[PDB]
Design a binder for this molecule. Structure first.
Ligand SMILES: [Ca+2]
Ligand SMILES: [Ca+2]
Ligand SMILES: [Ca+2]
Ligand SMILES: [Ca+2]
Lengths: 115, 148
């Protein structure tokens, strides 16, 4: 294999460690980019949590057939004679999801701070 | 200046009505766990404590209506003012022209912030009917989040 994948060729394999460590060189890719890197962490968390949040309510009448069957089968619920519609269920699931969305906003603001 | 919205408050009040279950008029951490189980989820007690941290000015260990209203209302400010989610998409744009490459989009969503598997990022692409080519616009995602 005459061709080389990386020009630098510093090492045969690259090791990645989860812990940050006490001392490390910052590195250079264009330092101004690292301002975006701190901001991206809450943005990434909010987008993922928002998508998870929206998917629970995505459909009722035709789609979300499996969810509808699972909800109907459970024993605790009463026959729903009084109200045909079920928004309250949709509101209830998407209400718990936003607590994670809001606390991810606070925690990933803390991740932005590097304290 | 503008009058507060009663129709949106009514959704919040129904959620509050459902959420209280020991029936004392206020929602505590173990009731939130009780709601979670009823949605098929059994999170850790520490998680239930942590996800409540936001809600209260004074930290009263149980959630009163305006604080519950603020928790529910806070999401509405993102819906009403869509600037936060719109800007949250914007910080990932590699070229600055409003179109984001598909290959770039998968790695920064999957491996960063909250971590989600390939099957979960498939739903975001497919259910919004995004095209095979690299240019993906993110304005449509904000509009999908806010139009309905
Ligand atoms: Ca209660
Ligand atoms: Ca309070
Ligand atoms: Ca672009
Ligand atoms: Ca495209």
């Amino acid at each position: 294999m005459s061709y080389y994948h990386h020009h630098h060729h510093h090492d045969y394999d690259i090791p990645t460690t989860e812990n940050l460590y006490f001392q490390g060189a910052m590195g250079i890719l264009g330092s101004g980019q690292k301002h975006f890197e701190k901001r991206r962490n809450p943005a990434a968390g909010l987008i993922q949590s928002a998508w998870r949040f929206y998917a629970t309510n995505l459909s009722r009448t035709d789609l979300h057939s499996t969810w509808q069957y699972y909800e109907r089968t459970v024993t605790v619920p009463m026959y729903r004679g009084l109200e045909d519609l079920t928004p309250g269920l949709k509101v209830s699931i998407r209400a718990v999801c936003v607590m994670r969305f809001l606390v991810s906003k606070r925690k990933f603001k803390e991740s932005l701070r590097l304290d | 200046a503008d009058q507060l919205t009663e129709e949106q408050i009514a959704e919040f009040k129904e959620a509050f009505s459902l959420f209280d279950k020991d029936g004392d008029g206020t929602i505590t951490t173990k009731e939130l766990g009780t709601v979670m189980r009823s949605l098929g989820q059994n999170p850790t007690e520490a998680e239930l404590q942590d996800m409540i941290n936001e809600v209260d000015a004074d930290g009263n260990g149980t959630i009163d209506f305006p604080e519950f209203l603020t928790m529910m209302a806070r999401k509405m400010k993102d819906t009403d003012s869509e600037e936060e989610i719109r800007e949250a998409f914007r910080v990932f744009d590699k070229d600055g022209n409003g179109y984001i490459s598909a290959a770039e989009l998968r790695h920064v969503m999957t491996n960063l912030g909250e971590k989600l598997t390939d099957e979960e990022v498939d739903e975001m692409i497919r259910e919004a009917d995004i095209d095979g080519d690299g240019q993906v616009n993110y304005e449509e995602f904000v509009q999908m989040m806010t139009a309905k």
